[PDB]
């Protein structure tokens, strides 16, 4: 018994390709479209909620996840792989940062830790790479707002705006025409909803769309008062009703 697979399952082919990483990116291509747009005073991340059955309650399945009070994540590819990555990402923000410095990590460094975890699945013994690409949006005092993409290889890139998954090629082109460096958060939400309608086929409402923002601090979502320096989470998930309000003036 015991894990006898102590050798790499991802290796270089004669042409120089890393097969399993390439094949993981192929799995991401098949995945449902998700996107992110960076505004001057915030960031928006969005995706379609592909329901597996109409008897399924799609509210119980969250594709957009809070990592820290100021950082959120969305994905394209394999859902189960994403779920465990969120668990690991939430924990590493504490163990390797909050428990040392008494504050949450800046976006770039949390992203860096998630990338490390995904790189190790590319080299360690007896494991396949993760079959997901992540989009991580967040804010921190000294860097402001930022948006990052993390690929199965472990590579990450900062973006003004981008899309991943099914119809990413068309969605990226749409975002290039609309993005400028003076966009206000509400303008970015509007463009996010427009871009997503192109890749969605069936119903397009607040129950089939999942959307969250990184914006102003929310004191009403803190849960307590009395400490002036603690002002609340910048991450907020838009409600089903809040989405439909914006779909009328579309």
């Amino acid at each position: 018994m015991t894990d006898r697979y102590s050798f790499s399952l991802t290796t270089f082919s004669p042409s120089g390709k890393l097969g399993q990483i390439d094949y993981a990116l192929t799995a991401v291509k098949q995945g449902v479209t998700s996107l992110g747009i960076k505004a001057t005073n915030g960031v928006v991340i969005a995706t379609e909620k592909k329901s597996s059955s109409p008897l399924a309650m799609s509210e119980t399945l969250s594709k957009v996840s809070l990592l820290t009070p100021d950082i959120g994540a969305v994905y394209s590819g394999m859902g189960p792989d994403y779920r465990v990555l969120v668990d690991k990402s939430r924990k590493v923000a504490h163990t390797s940062y909050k428990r040392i410095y008494g504050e949450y990590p800046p976006t770039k460094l949390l992203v860096s830790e998630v990338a490390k975890i995904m790189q190790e699945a590319t080299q360690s013994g007896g494991v396949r790479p993760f079959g997901v690409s992540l989009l991580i949006a967040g804010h921190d005092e000294f860097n402001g707002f930022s948006l990052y993409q993390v690929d199965p290889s472990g590579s990450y890139f900062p973006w003004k705006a981008t899309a991943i998954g099914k119809g990413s090629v068309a969605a990226k082109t749409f975002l290039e025409k609309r993005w400028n460096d003076e966009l206000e958060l509400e303008d970015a939400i509007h463009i996010a909803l427009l871009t997503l309608k192109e890749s969605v086929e069936g119903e397009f409402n607040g129950d089939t769309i999942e959307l969250a923002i990184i914006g102003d601090e929310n004191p009403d979502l803190l849960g307590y008062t009395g400490i002036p320096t603690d002002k609340g989470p910048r991450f907020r998930k838009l409600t089903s009703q809040e989405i439909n309000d914006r779909l009328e003036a579309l």
Binding site: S6, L9, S15, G16, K116, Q119, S146, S155
Partner: protein, 244 residues
């Protein structure tokens, strides 16, 4: 058992070559070119970003050029994720030396240890090698300014001027042509940019597809300064040499 699925990453070919090392070098030859040039009064590091998109955030970005300590930096060619694993090890190693001896680590010592780690992945453990080649640029009070390169085999060598990644064959011929020993930093800056401009697979070399850095003694008296160039500073240096 599991023998069936073992690639045997650390074996010899009948010709006495290491399959996985050779294939990793083949991977690196498709990565963006990076150039290092050593002058008498400093060192230049120049690298080409891999085909950029207009919506990429260029200023808050780092892909090619990384700081190891205040006196040493590296240019990367290969898988970035693999490189960051090695960079963090190198950063820690530098601090271990400083803690032990109360002196900044000599460049070669850091290069040797990082190269020794790479070597290990080719002899034991059954894991794939790191698909990365480094250009090391640094200063110490023994040898002064130094350029090194290491590759997946764990072999390292010293250089006056060198390139890694794509089109090294063409790049090396061009550097060999115009390099001379009494060269100054500002001349080396020009040579680095001119070489990338001629070897690039792109239509034209622009500020948004480059990372640039210098290591000079151009601080105030007998001390060394690392300058990682900002986007606007690359835009200016590209105009100053008349490439754009």
């Amino acid at each position: 058992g599991s023998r069936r699925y073992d690639s045997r990453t650390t074996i010899f070919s009948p010709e006495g070559r290491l399959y996985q090392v050779e294939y990793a070098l083949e991977s690196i030859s498709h990565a963006g070119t990076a150039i290092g040039i050593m002058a008498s009064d400093g060192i230049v590091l120049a690298a080409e970003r891999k085909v950029t998109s207009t919506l990429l955030e260029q200023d808050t970005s780092t892909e090619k050029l990384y700081k190891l300590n205040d006196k040493i930096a590296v240019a990367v060619a290969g898988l970035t994720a693999d490189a960051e694993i090695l960079i963090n090890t190198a950063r820690i190693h530098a601090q271990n030396y400083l803690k032990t001896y109360n002196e900044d680590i000599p460049v070669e010592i850091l290069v040797r240890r990082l190269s020794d780690i790479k070597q290990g992945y080719t002899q034991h453990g059954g894991l794939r090698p790191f698909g990365v080649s480094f250009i090391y640029a640094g200063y110490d009070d023994r040898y002064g300014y130094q350029l090194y390169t290491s590759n997946p085999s764990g072999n390292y060598t010293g250089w006056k001027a060198i390139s890694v990644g794509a089109n090294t064959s063409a790049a090396q011929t061009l550097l060999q042509m115009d390099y001379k020993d009494d060269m100054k930093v500002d001349d080396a800056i020009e040579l680095a940019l001119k070489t990338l401009s001629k070897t690039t697979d792109s239509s034209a070399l622009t500020y948004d597809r480059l990372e640039f850095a210098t290591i000079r003694k151009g601080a105030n008296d007998g001390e060394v300064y690392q300058k990682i160039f900002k986007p606007q500073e690359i835009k200016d240096i590209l105009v100053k040499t008349g490439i754009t």
